[PDB]
Each structure stands twice: as structure tokens, then as C-alpha cells.
Amino acid sequence: MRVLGLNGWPRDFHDASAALLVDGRIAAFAEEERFTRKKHGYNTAPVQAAAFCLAQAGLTVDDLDAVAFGWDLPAMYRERLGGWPHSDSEALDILLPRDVFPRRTDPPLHFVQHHLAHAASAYYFSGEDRGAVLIVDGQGEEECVTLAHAEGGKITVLDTVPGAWSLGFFYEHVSEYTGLGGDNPGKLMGLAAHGTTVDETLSAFAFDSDGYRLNLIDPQARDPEDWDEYSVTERAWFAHLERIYRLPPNEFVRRYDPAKGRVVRDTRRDPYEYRDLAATAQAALERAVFGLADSVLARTGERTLFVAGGVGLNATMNGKLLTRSTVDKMFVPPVASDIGVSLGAAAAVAVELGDRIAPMGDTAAWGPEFSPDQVRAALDRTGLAYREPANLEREVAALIASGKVVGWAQGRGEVGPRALGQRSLLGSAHSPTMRDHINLRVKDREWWRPFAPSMLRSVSDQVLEVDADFPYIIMTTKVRAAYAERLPSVVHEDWSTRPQTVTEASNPRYHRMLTELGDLVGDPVCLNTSFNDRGEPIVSSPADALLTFSRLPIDALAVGPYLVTK
Numbered sequence: 060m061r062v063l064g065l066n067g068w069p070r071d072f073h074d075a076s077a078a079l080l081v082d083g084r085i086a087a088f089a090e091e092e093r094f095t096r097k098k099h100g101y102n103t104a105p106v107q108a109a110a111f112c113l114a115q116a117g118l119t120v121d122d123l124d125a126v127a128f129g130w131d132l133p134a135m136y137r138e139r140l141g142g143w144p145h146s147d148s149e150a151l152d153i154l155l156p157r158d159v160f161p162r163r164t165d166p167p168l169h170f171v172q173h174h175l176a177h178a179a180s181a182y183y184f185s186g187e188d189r190g191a192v193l194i195v196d197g198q199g200e201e202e203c204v205t206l207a208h209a210e211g212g213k214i215t216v217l218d219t220v221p222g223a224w225s226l227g228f229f230y231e232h233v234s235e236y237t238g239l240g241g242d243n244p245g246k247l248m249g250l251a252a253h254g255t256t257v258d259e260t261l262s263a264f265a266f267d268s269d270g271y272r273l274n275l276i277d278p279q280a281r282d283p284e285d286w287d288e289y290s291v292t293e294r295a296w297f298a299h300l301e302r303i304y305r306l307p308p309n310e311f312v313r314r315y316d317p318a319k320g321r322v323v324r325d326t327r328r329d330p331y332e333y334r335d336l337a338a339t340a341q342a343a344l345e346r347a348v349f350g351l352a353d354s355v356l357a358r359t360g361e362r363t364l365f366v367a368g369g370v371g372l373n374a375t376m377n378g379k380l381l382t383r384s385t386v387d388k389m390f391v392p393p394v395a396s397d398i399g400v401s402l403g404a405a406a407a408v409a410v411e412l413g414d415r416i417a418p419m420g421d422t423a424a425w426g427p428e429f430s431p432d433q434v435r436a437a438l439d440r441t442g443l444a445y446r447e448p449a450n451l452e453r454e455v456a457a458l459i460a461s462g463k464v465v466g467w468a469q470g471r472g473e474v475g476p477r478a479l480g481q482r483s484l485l486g487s488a489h490s491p492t493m494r495d496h497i498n499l500r501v502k503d504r505e506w507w508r509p510f511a512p513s514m515l516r517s518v519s520d521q522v523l524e525v526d527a528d529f530p531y532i533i534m535t536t537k538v539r540a541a542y543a544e545r546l547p548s549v550v551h552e553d554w555s556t557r558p559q560t561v562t563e564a565s566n567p568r569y570h571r572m573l574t575e576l577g578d579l580v581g582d583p584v585c586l587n588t589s590f591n592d593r594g595e596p597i598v599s600s601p602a603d604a605l606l607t608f609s610r611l612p613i614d615a616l617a618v619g620p621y622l623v624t625k
């Protein structure tokens with residue numbers, strides 16, 4: 060079967076994406092924001108992402124066996140907005156506008172339950188027969204947590220928790236409160252490391268062996284003027300935090316900066332001041348999730364754990380789950396946030412149709428790639444001089460080894476929040492100054508933010524103390540003694556890191572580059588941070604990369620077979 064999964068709706072949505080499964084395999088997969096250049100893919104069908112998928116696969120909607128959506132959208136409309144007004148054709152006309160997607164007839168349209176869709180994106184691509192499923196996000200249609208069982212093709216829901224007790228929402232509001240912003244929980248995760256946990260209950264959570272209990276909010280509490288309990292949980296949390304925490308909300312500040320020539324946003328306080336509140340929001344989250352994980356594992360008698368939902372992006376929480384006593388094996392897909400429920404809905408549908416879903420295979424390079432001719436066009440358009448180095452990987456490794464920062468734009472763009480060697484900014488893992496250089500001089504961002512290393516899987520074994528695939532930078536782990544002090548820019552004081560392991564299969568060109576680096580600095584390890592400027596998505600097109608390369612003091616840009624310097 061050919062199944063096009065979708066996420067993103069014009070009204071009140073985020074992280075639109077489109078994913079194409081063809082006979083179990085991922086033909087194409089991309090996030091709308093990469094094409095629009097507007098962060099987060101807000102309020103829209105994944106028009107361009109879907110456009111790209113069909114084009115990649117060489118298909119029209121008429122070649123499609125099914126279009127799947129990653130929410131029970133008609134059900135949300137019935138429940139929260141009093142009426143699902145559309146016909147499956149009027150639905151498809153909004154999701155796949157007729158002027159971009161011409162069709163002889165509507166394909167079958169499936170709505171897949173939101174958490175099932177998350178669960179699908181973890182299970183069917185993990186490469187494991189069975190396990191415990193733990194879905195933890197902001198909020199699907201009603202629930203905010205799902206504990207389910209994955210066995211022989213089937214996912215079976217055991218229990219759920221209602222939206223008012225969301226831990227995604229909880230985390231977000233703390234994120235907002237700190238001045239970090241609700242749309243930057245990752246930054247909060249990052250800040251935590253610098254904090255000191257005081258009272259992990261925050262005077263709200265009561266923890267137990269199965270999870271948590273939230274006496275601050277009525278669990279059946281619900282918003283009349285909406286279709287999720289965000290605004291509800293917001294008032295409750297914000298009111299609570301100001302009672303118990305020594306600082307009031309950080310407020311955002313809108314002023315005209317005569318140096319920028321714009322009205323820019325800023326925060327009244329330095330968000331670093333809330334590091335204690337951050338350290339504590341993190342600890343609360345870990346403690347709640349440790350309980351849920353334990354619960355769903357013991358009920359399924361499983362020992363492989365599947366995690367998905369926005370909270371599954373907490374690489375710090377993931378790492379601690381991993382080392383947990385109750386966990387032997389664990390899979391969290393790179394697309395654990397909503398961007399994944401396209402892929403998830405498609406999989407759930409493909410499986411119903413008798414398809415067999417193939418494992419991701421330690422890669423997420425499912426977006427757009429570009430011909431050397433196409434790249435050449437983008438360069439020739441700019442009039443910059445460039446080279447076609449005989450051995451791009453060797454020269455690229457030499458630049459990195461010497462402490463220069465290199466823009467790396469190669470192959471199919473990677474899907475998800477984290478760059479994985481398709482669209483990366485690369486630098487020395489070995490440099491004691493690289494971190495402050497990239498954070499402060501290169502990206503103009505907070506000094507306290509961390510960086511993640513890319514290493515050959517073939518030496519993962521000796522660098523990290525867990526001989527396991529870490530393909531997505533979505534799980535923290537500890538480096539071994541021998542490497543703790545060698546990799547100053549990618550290993551915390553803690554000795555923890557968020558690694559990407561690389562295989563020759565997943566990325567021949569990059570694997571080849573790290574290898575060359577090895578011969579230069581001894582370890583085939585490097586710094587690997589997202590390729591973009593403060594307020595943009597990771598770059599997608601060669602034009603996208605030139606543009607960004609233009610306003611960053613990077614040293615060189617390896618885009619396609621071409622090297623460009625400064």
C-alpha cells in the first residue's frame with residue numbers, strides 16, 4: 060500500500076507534517092516549517108510537505124491507497140466545537156488543497172486517534188516485536204498520558220490520564236514562566252542542568268510507584284471555550300508558581316532597538332535566574348515519568364519501553380529511564396513530538412491494510428535532497444566563488460580538526476528538531492573553547508546551552524558506557540573515563556552527553572568524514588549543532604544554507620560536493 064499520513068489543520072494546530080509510507084517503507088517525510096521557513100508549522104495543513112512527499116515518490120493523490128490524519132479531528136469537533144461540519148471530501152480539500160494536489164477522486168480518509176498515532180510512530184519503527192508503550196505529551200483529544208501494550212502488530216490501551224494533569228503543559232508553563240518561553244521547553248531541559256532541586260513536589264505533585272497525582276488541579280477540569288486544557292492548566296500553574304516560588308513570572312519585553320532597526324522581543328529578567336525552578340520542574344517530570352514507565356512495564360511484563368509524545372523529547376529523562384532497573388531496551392523515535400503523528404497515522408493505517416512496517420534504521424534523512432546541478436544553481440545565483448574539492452570529507456575533517464566551524468548540508472534533510480549530519484553546523488568536540496565560540500559568537504545564544512557529539516557507532520562502544528545505538532540525539536548517556544576529559548565541548552561536568560551514533564549505512568559521506576577526523580585528532584568525534592540562525596528552522600534548501608552561511612561567522616560551507624569559504 061501507498062499511504063500518505065498527515066498532520067496540521069488550519070485551525071489551532073502546530074507542527075504540520077506529511078509522511079509517505081510505500082509498502083512499509085518511508086518514501087518521504089518532512090515538516091512543513093522547513094518549506095515555509097516559519098518555525099513550528101502553526102495553523103496549516105502540511106501543504107508543502109505533502110507536495111514534497113508526492114513529488115519525491117513520483118505520485119499523485121490518485122496513486123494513494125489512503126490519506127490518514129493523526130487526530131480524531133471529527134471527534135474533537137463534535138465534542139469541543141459542537142459539530143463536525145465537513146464531508147470526507149471537504150476534509151481532504153482543506154488538507155490537500157485542490158490547486159496543489161489535483162485528484163480524479165478522493166482517496167479513503169482515515170482519522171487515527173492521536174495517541175495511537177504517537178504509539179504507532181514508536182512501535183512499528185523500533186524494530187522490536189513487543190513492549191510497553193508510554194505516550195506522554197501535552198494533550199491529544201482528551202487524555203495527556205497513554206499506557207499501552209505493543210504485541211504482534213497490535214497496540215492495546217491500558218490506561219490514560221486526563222488533559223488537566225498534563226506534564227507537557229506543566230513543563231511548558233514553567234518554560235513560559237521562566238521567560239524561556241512555552242515554545243522552548245528544550246531550553247528549560249537545558250537550564251535544569253544548572254539548577255539545584257529543592258522540593259521536587261513543587262507543592263503540587265504527589266508521587267507514587269505508578270506515576271503521579273496532581274492536587275493543584277481537578278483532573279476532570281475542562282475548558283468550555285476551547286478544545287484542550289491549555290488555558291485552564293496555565294492559570295492554575297501560573298497562579299501556583301507565584302505563590303510557592305521566590306520570583307514572579309518573567310515577563311516579555313517589546314522594544315524598538317535602534318541597532319537592529321526593529322521592535323525586538325526580550326525578557327525582563329535573565330532566565331538563568333530561574334535555574335532552581337528549572338532543575339525542580341525537570342526533577343518533577345522525571346519522577347512522574349519514572350512511575351508511569353514502571354507501571355506500564357510491570358503490567359505488560361515487558362522490558363522494552365516505547366516512548367512518544369512531546370515529553371519524549373526530554374533526552375535527560377530518557378537517559379535515566381534507560382539506566383533504570385526495569386528497562387532493558389528502549390526506543391524513542393526522533394519524531395516523538397506531533398511531527399511524528401503523520402508517520403504514526405500512516406503506519407497505523409498501512410498495518411490495518413496488511414502492510415509490514417520497516418524499522419527506521421538509525422536514520423531520519425527522509426526530507427529533500429538536491430542534485431549537484433541544483434546546488435550549483437543556488438550558488439551561481441549568489442555569485443560566490445566555490446570549489447569542488449576532490450576529497451570533500453578529508454578537507455572538511457581538516458577544517459574541524461583545526462578549530463573552524465563548518466556548515467554541512469548534504470543528502471536528504473533530516474526530520475525532527477535535532478540535526479543529524481544532513482543539515483549541521485560542525486566543530487571540534489575536543490576544543491575547550493568551541494562551546495563558548497559557537498554559543499556566543501556563532502549563534503548568538505545563551506552561554507549555558509549544551510552541545511551534542513556525533514561519533515562513529517564503531518567506537519560508540521568505547522566512548523559511551525552503553526553499547527547501544529543512539530541515532531537521534533534524544534537520549535542522554537554517560538561517557539567512559541577514557542573519554543570524559545578528551546571531549547570538553549560535548550560532555551558535561553556530569554560526564555553526561557546527548558550523542559549521535561553514526562553507521563556507514565545511515566550516512567556514508569558523514570561516517571567517512573568522522574573517520575577522516577579520527578586520523579586527525581584520534582577520535583572520530585565532533586560537535587554537531589543545528590544549522591540555522593536564531594529565529595529560523597533548520598535550513599533545507601541550498602539557498603536556505605547559503606542565506607544562513609551568509610550571516611553567521613562560519614568558516615566554510617560544504618553544500619553538496621561543493622566547499623565555500625570565508
Ligand SMILES: Nc1ncnc2c1ncn2[C@@H]1O[C@H](COP(=O)(O)OP(=O)(O)O)[C@@H](O)[C@H]1O
Pocket residue numbers: 074196197198199226227228229230231244245248344368369370371372373374395396397398
Ligand atoms: N525537552 C522536553 N522536556 C519536556 N517536555 C517537552 C520537551 N520538549 C517538548 N515537550 C513537551 O511536549 C508537549 C507537546 O507535545 P506534542 O505531542 O508535540 O503536542 P500536543 O501535546 O499538542 O499533541 C509540550 O507541552 C512540551 O511541554
Ligand SMILES: [Fe+2]
Pocket residue numbers: 173177196197198199368369396397
Ligand atoms: Fe501529541
Ligand SMILES: [K+]
Pocket residue numbers: 381382383384386387
Ligand atoms: K539497564
